[PDB]
Amino acid sequence: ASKKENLLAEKVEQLMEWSSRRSIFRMNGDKFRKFIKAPPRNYSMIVMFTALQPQRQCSVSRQANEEYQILANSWRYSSAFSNKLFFSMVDYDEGTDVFQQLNMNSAPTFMHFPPKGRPKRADTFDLQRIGFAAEQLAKWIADRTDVHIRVFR
């Protein structure tokens, strides 16, 4: 109805159209800002910050991405699938400006960006304690969003 309400609905449609072609949205700084930082939003965003370029040989990022793929695939096929939760990734070499804004000097990091407000302490996944099995990522997502993604491989 309102100008801001209509823009929001269009923005969500744009993410749903992206969804038909991708399970994970690969973002540079412009897209990150437009779809994750900019208001308004009524959806949660999960983001994997990664550095997957071969020359860097970031083994952790590589393995973590394999799990994140399994997760986002599980989402895609879920009976719980909706327009209220999306998965994105930001690669260091493509979104360097994003890493700097977030004061990230390494990878990988998984974060939840809620529709309102900023990420809370628990909105950074505790990778160093837990590891990055898709099932553990899913547990964390459930805790932060109440969306329960049941992993399959």
Binding site: Y92, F99, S106, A107
Partner: peptide
């Protein structure tokens, strides 16, 4: 190495 250090893009 065993850590992914990121300096410049």
């Amino acid at each position: 190495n065993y850590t992914c250090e990121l300096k410049y893009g």
